[PDB]
Design a binder for this molecule. Structure first.
Ligand code: HEM
Ligand code: HEM
Ligand code: HEM
Ligand code: HEM
Lengths: 142, 146, 142, 146
């Protein structure tokens, strides 16, 4: 669970990096499909699945929009991400293993873009936060 | 992977004793209940709204048997599992678009089903050999994903 | 999170198999050290780590006692397993990866011993439960 | 593993540009903070009670440098990583009693540190090659656990 320390750390980090959410999302998903090509099966319905493509950029905004929502609803992720959970559970059926993959990619992107802001303290809290997000998204799964 | 004679014998023993049209269906049905997201690829298989429905689903049962039979080629030549499943890997990836993580989950369900089937005979040593074998199969099935 | 359905399934299953907790613990830990020999490092303080040994049996009772506690405190695992979390977090320092390993071994044992009772429904609920237990034990980690 | 020329080149490039007495300490310190259970083996290092103390700890820095230096042998011969780390694997298992999952965690922290070091140049392609290399090292280090 997230402590008051974790919550302040995530809110503070987001305060600094939030302005670059679009870029973060684009970069994160682009890494995901390149480094973990198996994740592409979920986008088989797109005209193509390529790094930095219009589809990836749009999807980047969607995911980071979800993360922004999670930061605002950080006190209760399960309730806060209810709609997203239902979506991913019944319509998309995204194996939770992919949430871990994407979370790792998001951490990598933030480190490349904000090396000074992404301290070990910020890292541990954000990691705990993203795990909480992944679990909240899995709420309606089984 | 360097197989020991015990591992080779154990795999042959287990598979020769499994009734595929019973174990196959049970395995897939269990996977669809324990890891519901696996239902993603079975939209044309009919009713899967609950455990009982999945258990009564003839299409699920038929496919479970297909999957179990699909392991025979690996049992027959444990030293060439990668090449043996290359075609099947490309199929699941580019034709069926199946998330390969589901392979690991299915393997875990098979281990649970096999465990229930053999009881006390499914020792830690037998479990180790079985899981080692399944891990190689799972790895092979995911190799052609690009 | 555990639903009313999950809680009932786990309480019902434990009602049936609880009588065999000692045997379940011995078998589970014995499988863990054999199938995943790397877990033996946590017992490096013993002369050796062998299946079905007096030490493994004793430890099996400890773990299954923790599970019995989890079942009773199933409505709030975080609070229910506080002491155990503190123990595993600061004194033992057990990497959470091992909880996933042991949980798998527990499911395997229960399937070998109680094939009729361990239905897919009991399986999904116990799996969610054990994951909840692993997370509750990880509470005081970082 | 079949290494491509790009992967071989990328690994050499990254490691040749890394300042070991900076990256090493940063990596271990980050791992000790993000995955606190890794502190289990460093009781003789003294104060590891918080991020600040860990960053100021000379013994942590020294060991981080040792770990990074330990990767050079893998970089030099990418086709023999298993044999090259066999003795080190036995050491970590039987003498140090280190949980091998910690190797994966350390590798993840290294990837994070390297990403911060190279920024935009650490593309998905570079990340893929770096992680592939680290995965082989991690596998090799835990191979001799029995
Ligand atoms: C940090 C975790 C994630 C968040 C917060 C998130 C958020 C979202 C949101 C907000 C939507 C849009 C819903 C709508 O507008 O109707 C969406 C859709 C979707 N997400 Fe997720 N998602 C996450 C991870 C993933 C992962 C790892 C995958 C799979 C590799 C995935 C696959 C999809 C797909 C397939 C869609 C549908 C988009 C389309 O059809 O083009 N998501 N996501
Ligand atoms: C032990 C792992 C598995 C093996 C050995 C395996 C084997 C097979 C085989 C032999 C086929 C028939 C291929 C052909 O000749 O056309 C097949 C088809 C298929 N498999 Fe897999 N499979 C495995 C796991 C999975 C998993 C986990 C899923 C997804 C949850 C999956 C989904 C499918 C689907 C959708 C088909 C096509 C069914 C149809 O439309 O008739 N498979 N599999
Ligand atoms: C289902 C999860 C687990 C539960 C509920 C559990 C429960 C317990 C309990 C109740 C104790 C005794 C605490 C005391 O004496 O105050 C204990 C001790 C301990 N546990 Fe855990 N445990 C679990 C998993 C693990 C795992 C996976 C490992 C490592 C592979 C582990 C290693 C230890 C060790 C080293 C001790 C002390 C043993 C000794 O020094 O002789 N536990 N555990
Ligand atoms: C990238 C992975 C790693 C590499 C290449 C590596 C390399 C090394 C090397 C070269 C040594 C010196 C061995 C000697 O005495 O000759 C060593 C020692 C040691 N390693 Fe590892 N190691 C790795 C990861 C880890 C991790 C993640 C931990 C635990 C969290 C760990 C704990 C230790 C300890 C306790 C020592 C002994 C230090 C001392 O004597 O003060 N290592 N390692």
């Amino acid at each position: 669970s997230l402590s008051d320390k974790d919550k302040a750390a995530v809110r503070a980090l987001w305060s600094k990096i939030g302005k670059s959410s679009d870029a973060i999302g684009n970069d994160a998903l682009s890494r995901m499909i390149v480094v973990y090509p198996q994740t592409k099966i979920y986008f088989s319905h797109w005209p193509d699945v390529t790094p930095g493509s219009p589809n990836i950029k749009a999807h980047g905004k969607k995911v980071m929009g979800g993360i922004a929502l999670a930061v605002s609803k950080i006190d209760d992720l399960k309730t806060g991400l209810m709609e997203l959970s239902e979506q991913h559970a019944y319509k998309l059926r995204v194996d939770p293993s992919n949430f871990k993959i994407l979370n790792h990619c998001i951490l990598v992107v933030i480190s490349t873009m904000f090396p000074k802001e992404f301290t070990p303290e910020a890292h541990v809290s954000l990691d705990k936060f993203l795990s909480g997000v992944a679990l909240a998204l899995a709420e309606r799964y089984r | 992977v360097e197989w020991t004679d015990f591992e080779r014998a154990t795999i042959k023993d287990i598979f020769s004793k499994l009734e595929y049209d019973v174990v196959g269906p049970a395995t897939l049905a269990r996977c669809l209940v324990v890891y519901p997201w696996t239902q993603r690829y079975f939209g044309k298989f009919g009713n899967l709204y609950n455990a009982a429905a999945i258990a009564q689903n003839a299409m699920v049962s038929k496919h479970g048997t297909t999957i179990l039979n699909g392991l025979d080629r690996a049992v027959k030549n444990m030293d060439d599992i990668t090449n043996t499943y290359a075609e099947l890997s490309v199929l699941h990836s580019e034709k069926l678009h199946v998330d390969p993580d589901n392979f690991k989950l299915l393997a875990d369900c098979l281990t649970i089903v096999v465990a229930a089937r053999f009881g006390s005979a499914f020792t830690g040593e037998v479990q180790a050999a079985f899981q080692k074998f399944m891990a190689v199969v799972v790895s092979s099935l995911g190799k052609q994903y690009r």
